[PDB]
Structures are given as C-alpha cells and as structure tokens.
Symmetry: D3
Subunit: 241 residues, 6 copies
C-alpha cells in the first residue's frame, strides 16, 4: 500500500521497533552492512529518506543500527526521535574522522570523551555559554575496556564536530593540534547534549581515514579493516551497557 504509519516525520518504525541500545553511523548503507554481518534476528525498521535502520540482536542482546546522515542538524533529528519517541537509552556513534594531531595516525581508533564544535546548537541550550558536548563515562569506559579485551590500541580524547567539511578557516588546524583534538568529524557535538536532555547515554568511536596535515590516507581495504576493528569494539561495548 502507498502509505504506512509514521511515528515521526523521518521514521516509519513503530515504538518498540528500536532496541534500547543503538549504533548510528552517517552512511545508511554502512548501517545495512553492519546489520547484515553482525546482527541476528534482524529486520529493517526504517527506510524513510533512505535512512536505513535495523533492529536485531548482537550475541543475543537487543541492538539497533541506523544511519544518521551528515552533520549536526541531521543527527539531531534522528537522535532526538530515538530518545524521545523510541525510548532508546544508549546511542554509540560509529564513524570515520580526520585528524590533525601529530601523534594520531591513519587507521587509529579514537574513543571520544567530548567534542568541540563551530555550531551554535549548544550555546542555544545553555544561555549562550559554553556547554561541553560530553560522552557518558560508562559508554567511554565500555569502549575502552572492549578494545583492551580485543587487543586493539585506541586513542582516547577530544573530537571536533564541524558544520563545514570543506574548511577555508586559517589557523583552525593549528589550534586543534595545539590542544590535542584527536578526531575531526561532524556529528558527536550534537548527539551528546540530546542524550543529556533525555537523561540518557551516548558516546562515539571513530577510525581515522585521513591525516589532514600529512595528507596520509587509508586505502579502501585499510578503511574496511579499520571499520571491522572499530565495529567489533562498539558491538562488544553494547554488551556492557
């Protein structure tokens, strides 16, 4: 039939169709790959706007995975709905990033403790002041401990979520490196304050695809291996959450 129930303007899943724990990545096609290779009992629960989402189990524990699109405004829509309408308790963003830090390398796995931003969305939430987009400590710890159990080294520290992929901003990379921001992406800084609003949990893990300073770049095969390592860390972390 040409029409289905819509719980939100952006998601056709019914309440109850999402697990309490959700992995989100920017690319919905990567969400499908995760579901098709790591979940059992899996069903597709959303395809509105092509933003594929799936619910199943990982090692028997309910888990959903869904795309979030690119940028703070896009993840904010999807995450707000997940926490509010779908009653999700924990979201882990899984993704890729650039780096400027001189001691972070392509293929490294970065576990995000907090994320800076050039967006205004968090100033709007705290009377114009500085509101740190901060990962939940239990989520950070679950990711760190899972990586340790898997013998996968990790970088742990700050990300920077920009609204502008194609930066023209003189001095930005130098400041990010001086203060040891390890990951440049476009979303985490929008996710963490929404989790706070709902009394819920969020974190982020990313693999470095490109070094913005040295120009080093992971090949497609290296990116696949990096994502496999990262996704295994995230999946194992969900068992602790």
């Amino acid at each position: 039939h040409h029409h289905h129930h819509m719980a939100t303007p952006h998601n056709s899943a019914k309440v109850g169709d999402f697990a309490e724990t959700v992995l989100m990545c920017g690319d919905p096609l990567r969400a499908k790959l995760i579901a098709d290779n790591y979940l059992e009992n899996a069903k597709q629960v959303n395809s509105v706007r092509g933003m594929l989402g799936f619910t199943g189990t990982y090692k028997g524990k309910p888990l959903s995975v869904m795309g979030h699109g690119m940028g703070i405004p896009s993840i904010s829509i999807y995450a707000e709905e997940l926490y509010n309408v779908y009653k999700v308790k924990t979201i882990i963003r899984v993704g890729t990033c650039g780096t400027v830090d001189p001691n972070v390398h392509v293929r490294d796995v970065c576990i995000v403790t907090a994320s800076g931003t050039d967006s205004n969305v968090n100033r709007m939430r705290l009377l114009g002041h500085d509101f740190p987009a901060t990962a939940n400590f239990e989520v950070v710890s679950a990711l760190v401990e899972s990586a340790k159990a898997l013998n996968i080294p990790t970088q742990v520290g700050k990300a920077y979520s920009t609204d502008i992929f194609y930066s023209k901003e003189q001095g930005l990379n130098e400041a990010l490196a001086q203060y040891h921001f390890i990951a440049v992406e476009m979303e985490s800084a929008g996710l963490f304050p929404i989790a706070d609003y709902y009394g819920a949990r969020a974190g982020c893990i990313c693999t470095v695809s490109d070094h913005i300073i040295t120009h080093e770049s992971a090949t497609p095969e290296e990116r696949q291996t990096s994502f496999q390592n990262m996704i295994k860390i995230a999946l194992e972390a969900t068992l602790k959450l």
Copy 2:
C-alpha cells in the same frame, strides 16, 4: 566490481555527469521520483551514502536532480562539490517547509528571496558580520514568472534555515512572524553563500507542509499535489536559466 572511481568523498559521478543546472531536494527518494517522472535521457549518476542523483533532460535541456540530506552541513558538502568539481552553474533547492506567518497557509508555494539562520557558517565567511544568504535574482524571477505562466499563486519572501528541527526556543516563532518570514526549513541559508563563492547561481522554492502556529497540516495527497505544482514551476524555471 567492489570499487568505483570517486571524484569526491561523497559522489561517484565523473566530471561531466552533472548538467549545468541542478534541482536538489532533501530526500533522495524524492530525487528519484522527480527523475523517473519528469526527465528524459535519464541515468543515475550517484548512489554514495544513498544520496541518489540523476542526470537527463527536461524538455530537451540538460538537467540533474539529486538529494541533499537534511541540514546546512549536508547541503554544503553536496553543493560545494557540484559547483567546484562538477562545474554546475545553477542550483534550485526544491523542498518542503513549515510556516509561522499568519497569512501563509498549508499548500502554499514559497519562492525564497533570502534565508536567515541560526548557523554560524555565514558569520565565518564574513569576518563575524551579517552575511545575508541571498537568492540570485534571475533564479527568483524565473521561478516567479514560471508560476505566473502556470497560474499557480506564490508567496515570495524570506525563509529561515534552522539547525534544530525540534525547536525549544521561546520567542522564535513570534519574531519570525513579526518580520514576515514565510518559510521555515534547514538548508537554503547554507546554499546561497556557496553559490556566491563560485560566482554561480542558486535559489529555493518550497511548499508549506505544516503551519507551526495553527497546527494545520497537509495530508499526504495534498503534499503530493503541492509538490507537483512546485516541481513544475522549478522545471519550467530551468528553461530560463
């Protein structure tokens, strides 16, 4: 084969695969509907991240149509690439919007002359000052004249592009209405300054899906009819551009 050439990180189209004129809408599935119903000579030229794009002709004139995702950061990626890598000259954003204006109604067609925003991306381009995201006059005029020839009434005026769909901002709707902003969406304010940077052209036309104040809402069938009217205006406008 498991790998194709990538002209950008987000688009597998080769240079030359996009026409000089492009319609963009947020929903890639709507881009497909536009291509499948209004273009001839059509081919799919991108599917990276599910962000479908197509190139063909409308009444014999080359025209592309592609999704842009939700929010300023997402459209900025895709539009920057279209102007820079693909040498596009004109982008018309086609979409839906809310309204707060007391004399704008659900199903109305809004032609955007400029768009306000709560994003920082334009302050970053003009030394922290106010940079109006302004549609190109030839594009605005082409849309206005096409609607006149089709006997479709239009509202012509300002939009507001927000980073936050799920607004919690007291007083925003009252200020938007007081100054007669006619459309609330999430993208135009990011598109117009990129067109300026490249010495190129952009505009936006949107149909009102929801009245944010009165709670009126277009049914699915009404939204389809509204989109048909709007897309015909946009398509006819491309013949003048």
Copy 3:
C-alpha cells in the same frame, strides 16, 4: 511663530503630508534637488534638523522625497516614523556606494537584493541569529524593469551596510569581493527589517562613486550623470508600486 506641531521628535510634517511612496537619500540637499527637478505639486513638509523632506507628484502619482542622514541609526529613526506615523507603504533608498567587486565599475547602477552589515540591529530583532536585510521582490523587480525600459544597464545583488565609513578592517574587502557584494554603503541593512516589521515594502538603488580596490573615482560630472540615470529608474519604478 517660534513653534510648530511635531508629529515626531524629528519631523514636523502632519500625518497625511507624506505620500504612500517615498524616495530617501542620505543628503537632504539632494532630496531638495530631486524635488525641485522631478516633482510637481511639490511642497516642503519637513526641515527639522535640516533633514529636508518634500511631497508632490511624479507623472501625477503622489511621491515624497526626504533625506535620511548617514548610517543605520539615522535611517532607522526616519524610516520607522514614515512607516508607523505617516503610514507610508513603500520606501526606495536612492544613494551612492563604493564597490570592491572586480567586475563592478564606477558609474554602475546597483539594484540591491539584500544587504549585509556589521551592525547589531538585526541580531537584536531575531534572538541573536542571522536576519537577512532583504529587499521586497516587487520593488526590486520594478527597479529592474524600469532600468530595462530606459536601456540603462544594472548590477543586481548584495550590498554591505557598514557602521564605519573609515574602515581599518583587514580582510574585509577581500571577503566582500570573494562573495560578490556589489555595493558598500551605510543604510540599507537598517531599512529593510523596519519595512518587514510594518508589513511594508522597501528597496535600494545606488550608483558606484568609487572603486575601493582600483581607486577609480567618478568625477563630479560623472556622479551627476550617474545620479540622473539612477533617479529616473527609481522614479519610473514608483509608478509600478
């Protein structure tokens, strides 16, 4: 007698003494020149603070012309009063400007679609966000069509209204040129949002007196000819409004 009725602190005209359409220029002595050479049935209706204003007819249609002084705060006083107390419907600012754009030349006529600014007055109107000072489309179109009928070429695009004539701001000219701002003046960005507040119309047309980058400068005779061309465009446009 040493005292006359004052409808506002800045204007001795009685309500009804201003036509529904008004041209405003910064120099009150230029307002007098316009009245003395282009209006019939003309009377001086204000001289408070030397800010001369006149009401008569252009080709039989009621039209006023008045000075506005230099800068956003000055035009804001006079325009607020015109719309609020005097019930004016349409104001066209007529003036001179500088340019930094590499393809705009001294003596060019610029029709303003929107104006940026370094003033805070528009942030104050929209909860601290970006509020584009946007000309009314009917006014822009009337100016464009009048110039076409007169065979006078025009540049159509963005202005920048600064609070600081004597700029010391490194990088400003480069950013303005990069984004193709065509006119540098001091007032339009304050006028357009006031028109919006009152549900009324405004626009601006300016002639380039000086190229800020190349140092080219119109002679007094060239400025007179430029103003004659511009004023004829504006006057003819009022017949359409």
Copy 4:
C-alpha cells in the same frame, strides 16, 4: 561657481578652518544657533549635506561648532575627519538625552564619564573584547569645574549610546537603571575611541529632555533654558582646554 574644494567627502572646510577645540551637537541648526549667539569672529566653514559648521572665538579663544547628525556612524565620520584631517585636539559633544535613572530628572545636566553601547564598533577595535568608550579626564574635570563656577548642579556618570532610538528591547531600561546609567543618547560611545586613536581628547555633556520611565518631558521653553545652561558650561570648559 558650482564646485568647491573638498578636503573630505563630507566637509568643504580647508585644513586650518577648524579650531583645535570643537563643540559638536547632533542638530546642525543648533550648531548655527550656538555660533550666532556665543561666538565672535565667526564664519561658516562647512555646509556639505546641510551639516553646518562654524569657526570663531569664545571669549577670544578659537572655537568651532558643528553638527554631527544622529547615531554612531554619523558622528564617527565627522569626528574621524576633524581629528585626522583638521588636526583638532578636543571635541566636546553637547546634546540632549533621555534618562531611566530614578534620581535623574528632566532638565538635569549630565556630564558623561563613559558610555555603553549596543554598537559593534568598539568590539571591532579591540579584538572583540570590551573597550570602554571613556571620556578624557581633563575634559570631564573642566566641565565639572565650569558648572561649579556657574552654580549649575550636574549629574556625573555613565551614558548609553544606542543604535536604536525606537527601542523594543524588553529589560533594557531596567538594567540601565539598576547600574545607574544617567543618560541615553546615540553618539558618545562612538566619539571617545576615535579621540583615543588620535591621541586626542573628547567628552560629552547632555541635558535630560525626557524621563523614559516616568514619562516626564521638558517643554520647549524648558529645553531652551536647559540648553543655555549646558552650553555655557561647555563654552567655559573650552577655556580650560
């Protein structure tokens, strides 16, 4: 002859035609009244844009008086030129103001020690920080001592220079009163930093025309008497400067 030498775009006076000490008021017609009633040896030195200026002597000492128009951008043009081109050393702004302070009354004379503002012009001068627009102490003291010698009571304290005469700003009056701002005007905050830039001196004295809270208002005759008291204080102060 239809053309005269222009030392600046806004002033036809030749260098040397302005005294080292200048009184400026917003209304050029008031500048004429001051010249015609208090100066000897007087000549009109500017009439561009109707912004009348005069040079003569007060009690034998060279003194100029000129209008400055309304608002920070207007006074900034004229004062920048006076200090830079005309080599002026001291400017005293003489004007009218409103008040919100519960212990300041209509007809009071206010001597300004510093002026707040809603303009961005001073942030632009100090890397975005707070730059207090501060009167020169010798000027303040000369005004205070002159008023004492004339037995004229004065209020001494902060002004607030707004870009928006027609305020719509909730809470502004309450904050201004809480911190004992004594005068509301539109110019001093732009004058004092320009004097600083040139290593020169500035101050301001104003008479209260209106109480913004109680709605009390000076009659025309009361405003004349107030201005007479204020101008005598300013004139006597110039003899000390």
Copy 5:
C-alpha cells in the same frame, strides 16, 4: 633575608621543588591541612601571596599540594606555571561545589568528566568556537576506580565553572539541571585546556556543599567528612598516575 629567588611572579619554588603530580584546592589553608595530615617527607615550597604549596610523598610516591585561589584567572596562573616552569605532568583539582541536579545531594562526591563555563578563555583558544574543557580519561578512571576500592559512591559527569559566584542569572539553574550538570564551581574549565596545551593531564573531584535548589547545606562536620572521603579518593588515584 628580605628577598628570595622567584621562578615565576607568583611562586618562589625552584624548578624541581614540585612533584610531577599535584593536587590543587582553592583554599591554601586547606592545602596546608592536606600536607600536614596526608604527606610524608613534606616541605613548604611556596608562600607568595599566601598561596601555600607543599611537596612530599603519599605512600612513598612524590606528590605536591597547593592552593589555586578562586576563579578561572587565578587557577590559570598557577596551573600554567606548574605545567610550564615546574614540569608537572598531572594536576587533580580537589574542591567543593554546589549542585542543581535533582538527583545529586549534599555530601555527594562528584568526579568531573568535562566542565562548561561562562568565561571566554576557551573561545579565545579555539578561534571563537566551542572548546570543551575535558578531563583526561586516565585521571577520571583513576578517581572512579579509587572510589570503588574505597566503597565510596560517586556521581560522574559535567561541572559548570562560573566567573560569578553571586549569580543573578534567570534560567541558568533550570538549564544546568535540564542537562544534568552535577557540580557548580569556578575553576575546572580553566584547568583542563591548559593541561591540553602542555600535553599533560588534569581532572577534578569535588564534594557537594550546598544544593542550590533545595537549599540543603552540609554542616561543618559533614563538610569535613566529605572532604576526608574525597581527599582519600584523590590521593589513592595519584598512585595510579
């Protein structure tokens, strides 16, 4: 002798007189209490401005303790010097705080993951953007694990470092509670970015003295017991760092 060597304007300690790990609290008299009750091998190494500092050992491991005064500017001076001149590697701020969170109680121990602020110091470090003042994960984890081993419950989450103890800011407490800020203090947000600049580590642990909403307040004896619990957690954590 009336004069001693000064390695910095604020500290008479010689380089080498501070251990690589330092506890800092606002009250220098509390620093003395910590040294006199928990350190062996202890000596006073600074008394400039009364800002007492001490170096000794805790369970044999070198450890310093010093006051930092109240507010971001004060801690910034002392911490900058400790990392830069004294080559410190790890600073743990130990202190007291208020809370607004409905589920945080007087006497609770809060381990800070990141701290918001109303200061501009971090915007100045990151081109005007949002720079989250973020604790080092190893420090956070050491505090969490030490509290667990001591069977002391802890709250783990965000602090807010204000410049204004005596807040008059309507809506601040409501926003802080909505986003589950657990601790209100005046310093952590200045410490963490300095540690980042030096490639070093910092964290913060605080005990709740007052509930800002309910008005509950710890008695002097309760504050002593709370501080004893907190200091034992911090001291044990230093053995892991």
Copy 6:
C-alpha cells in the same frame, strides 16, 4: 574554638567590622603590610582562605584594607560581599600593572578612569551589550588631587582587566597601545559594575611594574618605592571620600 561565625562563605568578619571605605589589593600579605604601617586602632577582621583583612583608622578616619586575590571572579566575590553584607560605600583598588603604552614607564602611577576586559561578566549585566566598567568620578578626582598635593606625577586613563595573565593573543598589545590603554591588570573591570549595582563608589590606582613591550622591569626596591607613593595617594584620597 574550632568554629567561628561566618557572615559570608568567604569572610568571618561581623557586619560593622569593616569601615565604609576600603582599600583592596590582590596580595593579602600586602594588605597586612599596609595595615601594619599606615593604620592605627587596627585589628584583623578576616583570615578565611588566607585572605587577610584589617580595619583601623588612617589619620583618625575609619579605613579597612583587605586582599582580593587575582582575577575578576575573585574580586567579584569579595567586593559583592563588602558592598552588600558589610555596607561599604567606597572601595579603592590598589595594585600593580603592566603597560604597553609607549609613553608610560615602569614606576609610573596610573589612576584608572575605566577598564576594558576580555571577561563576559559585564555583557551578562547589560543584555549582552557593552557596559563600560567606569570608576566613580569623585574617587578619580580624590586620587588625582591627592597625588597633586603630594607632588607625585600620575597617568590618568583606561586600564584593561584580563582573565589571562599568560597571554598568547596576537595583536592584543598593538590594539591596547593604539588606543592608549595605560594599565594591564586583572580586576578593575569586575569591581566597578558591582559598585554601580549597589549605588556605591569604586576606583583604582596602580603602579607599573613591567613594560610589556620594552621589557623594562622595576627592581624589588623600585616596586617598594612605587607602592609607597601609590599607597600614600590612596590613603590621602580616602580622607576626601
């Protein structure tokens, strides 16, 4: 006994223990030196946090002296309490400063008319606008006249109160010098608006310890002599207040 009455969280003095006039300096040990050498009838009235305060008489007139610590947040606590709880009428800050002005020299005495800042505390008080931290004119005049009677030359003008002693800010010194800021310190800009809030008086006098540009620096003996000159000016000024 291990516990005393606390009128505030930071001051054990009882109401009435502070005189209506107070000198404050950053270093509490310097407050003690002032009390021990210039006051009679003196008693120590506070030692909480080591922030020594004393009350006695100078030439028979009640006078207190107390430390304020370093930075705007610290002085704000102590001064707010002094005006609010202790009913103080006049505070003179006495301190040291740097200078960048080319005509200000080490050992000079600077009397502050107003102070700029990089803090947000004054924007928070005036709806986000520019609120000049302005000394009371009677206090400034008392300091100026006292220095004259003592034959001590003074510089009179603007200070700049920074949150960051260890500046890394390119261009700051050049802007401060261009606009003739004479003193760089960390506190005055926080004191003056608090005095305004309470309808009370404040000022500041400082001696130049270091020239930030030329690197000149006062020796310890020169700083002692400078402080003696400055404190005598301040003490004599209190007799006029």
